[PDB]
Ligand binder design. Structure first.
Ligand SMILES: [Cl-]
Length: 129
């Protein structure tokens, strides 16, 4: 599924992301925009043997199991295919675990490079929330 911005914001709010660990909703929408362009089926296959999966481009070395990645930790305790669904619940649950395991949002390279220090409220402006 390719989400709209406001539709994704509403889904993320229903799943508890607004102000999760001090990160406002616009941060999460901005991260999804620049990681995947709002596409739930996005995959990026890296040269190190790992793959980034889904709307938040979660990596297979530490977070999910794809059976093909060296050094796998599977800290979200899920198959990586669960991150390619049209429903965002598995991606949101794993994103919460990434911040709970002592990372901030710096774990997402696109957040650090394209969202940090910007007006992230722009990403939710005008939406029905
Ligand atoms: Cl907000």
């Amino acid at each position: 599924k390719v989400f709209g911005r406001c539709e994704l914001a509403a889904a993320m709010k229903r799943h508890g992301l607004d102000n999760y660990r001090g990160y406002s909703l616009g941060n999460w929408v901005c991260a999804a925009k620049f990681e995947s362009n709002f596409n739930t089926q996005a995959t990026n296959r890296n040269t190190d043997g790992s793959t980034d999966y889904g709307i938040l481009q979660i990596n297979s070395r530490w977070w999910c199991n794809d059976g093909r990645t060296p050094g796998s930790r599977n800290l979200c305790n899920i198959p990586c295919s669960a991150l390619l669904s049209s429903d965002i619940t598995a991606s949101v649950n794993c994103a919460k675990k990434i911040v709970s395991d002592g990372n901030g949002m710096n774990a997402w390279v696109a957040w650090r490079n394209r969202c940090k220090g910007t007006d992230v409220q722009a990403w939710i402006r005008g939406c029905r929330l």
